[PDB]
Design a protein around this ligand. Structure first.
Ligand SMILES: NC(=O)[C@H]1CCCN(C(=O)Nc2cccc3c2SCCC3)C1
Ligand SMILES: [Zn+2]
Length: 139
């Protein structure tokens, strides 16, 4: 679990969105596993606007942060799960690192701010949904 809180927005994994997220929906994209909802409070985070390929992410299944080298946002095949049919997920970045199903929502950050959130994983890999191209989150 986890979310990004920026301005009057809450960014979460679309497959983990609550009834309240859907009732206050701003934007969602099943191909990116992202959903953004509106909030009444201002929130704590800032978004990176950069091309970093190294950063640090929070891994809830180890209660620890780990440094990672990650690929550029791209279209990657993701096997069927209880949440989605087999499909290509877009704007996804892979890295070698530990992750388990409940780790989705963990934040990836570089020196410039929040880069994205944990969205996929398995066998010593961890996939992050990029948020750096969503320029409207800052206004
Ligand atoms: N973005 C998606 O389509 C996700 C939706 C939730 C289920 N999917 C996962 O990749 N879950 C997951 C996360 C982290 C680690 C492991 C897993 S499943 C296998 C064991 C490792 C696909
Ligand atoms: Zn950066």
């Amino acid at each position: 679990s986890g979310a990004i809180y920026v301005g009057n927005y809450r960014v979460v994994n679309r497959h983990l969105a609550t009834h309240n997220d859907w009732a206050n929906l701003v934007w969602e994209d099943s191909s990116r596993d992202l959903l953004v909802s509106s909030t009444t409070a201002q929130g704590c985070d800032t978004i990176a606007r950069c091309d970093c390929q190294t950063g640090v992410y929070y891994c809830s299944s180890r209660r620890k942060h780990y440094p990672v080298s990650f690929s550029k946002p791209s279209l990657i095949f993701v096997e069927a799960s209880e949440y989605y049919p087999a499909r290509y997920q877009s704007h996804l970045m892979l890295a070698v690192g530990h992750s388990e199903p409940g780790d989705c929502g963990g934040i990836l950050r570089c020196q410039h701010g929040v880069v994205g959130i944990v969205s996929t994983g398995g066998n010593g890999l961890v996939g992050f949904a990029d948020v750096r191209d969503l320029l409207w989150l800052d206004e």
